[PDB]
Amino acid sequence: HWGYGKHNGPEHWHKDFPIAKGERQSPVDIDTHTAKYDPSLKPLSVSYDQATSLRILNNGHAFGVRFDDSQDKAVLKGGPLDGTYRLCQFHFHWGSLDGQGSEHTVDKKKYAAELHLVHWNTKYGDFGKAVQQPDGLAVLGIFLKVGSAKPGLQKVVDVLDSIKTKGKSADFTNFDPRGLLPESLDYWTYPGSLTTPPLLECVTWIVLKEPISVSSEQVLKFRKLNFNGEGEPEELMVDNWRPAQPLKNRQIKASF
Ligand SMILES: [Zn+2]
Taking the centre of ligand 1 as the mean of its atom positions, its distance from the CA of residue 104, in whole angstroms, is: 10
Taking the centre of ligand 1 as the mean of its atom positions, its distance from the CA of residue 30, in whole angstroms, is: 16
Amino acid identity of 41? Answer: L
In contact, 51 and 74? CB cutoff 8 Å: yes
Residues flagged as binding site for substrate: 195-196
CA distance 137 to 131: 7
Taking the centre of ligand 1 as the mean of its atom positions, its distance from the CA of residue 194, in whole angstroms, is: 7
Pairing of the two strands 137-146 and 63-67:
unpaired
Instruction: Tell me the domain boundaries of the chain.
Output: 13-254
In contact, 206 and 76? CB cutoff 8 Å: yes
Taking the centre of ligand 1 as the mean of its atom positions, its distance from the CA of residue 27, in whole angstroms, is: 9
C-alpha pair distances (Å), 250 with each of 70, 126, 164, 213, 216: 33, 27, 38, 30, 36
CA distance 141 to 115: 6
Per-residue buried b or exposed e for 63-79, using 16+ beta carbons within 10 Å of the residue's own CB? bbbbbbbeeebbbbbeb
CA distance 227 to 166: 6
Q: Which residues are catalytic?
A: 61
Count of CB atoms situated within 10 Å of the CB of 95: 21
Taking the centre of ligand 1 as the mean of its atom positions, its distance from the CA of residue 159, in whole angstroms, is: 20
In contact, 169 and 56? CB cutoff 8 Å: yes
Instruction: Return the CATH architecture of domain 13-254.
Output: Roll (3.10)
Taking the centre of ligand 1 as the mean of its atom positions, its distance from the CA of residue 190, in whole angstroms, is: 15
C-alpha pair distances (Å), 202 with each of 25, 61, 114, 127, 208: 10, 20, 19, 11, 19
In contact, 43 and 79? CB cutoff 8 Å: yes
In contact, 40 and 224? CB cutoff 8 Å: no
Query: Which of 131, 142, 64, 69 has its CA nearest to residue 102?
Result: 142
CA distance 116 to 62: 11
The approach used to solve this structure was: X-ray
CA distance 149 to 163: 22
> Given in angstroms, what resolution was this structure solved at?
1.8
Count of CB atoms situated within 10 Å of the CB of 135: 17
In contact, 189 and 82? CB cutoff 8 Å: no
Amino acid identity of 229? Answer: G
CA distance 23 to 41: 23
Residues flagged as binding site: 91, 93, 116, 195-196
Amino acid identity of 28? Answer: V
How long, in residues, is the chain? 256
Residues flagged as binding site for Zn(2+): 91, 93, 116
Three-class SS of the chain = CCCCCCCCCCCCHHHCCHHHHCCCCCCCEECCCCCEECCCCCCEEEECCCCCEEEEEECCCCEEEEECCCCCCCEEEECCCCCCEEEEEEEEEECCCCCCCCCCEECCECCCEEEEEEEEEHHHCCHHHHCCCCCCEEEEEEEEEECCCCHHHHHHHCCHHHHCCCCCEEECCCCCHHHHCCCCCCEEEEEECCCCCCCCCCEEEEEECCCEEECHHHHHHHCCCECCCCCCCCCECCCCCCCCCCCCCCCCEECC
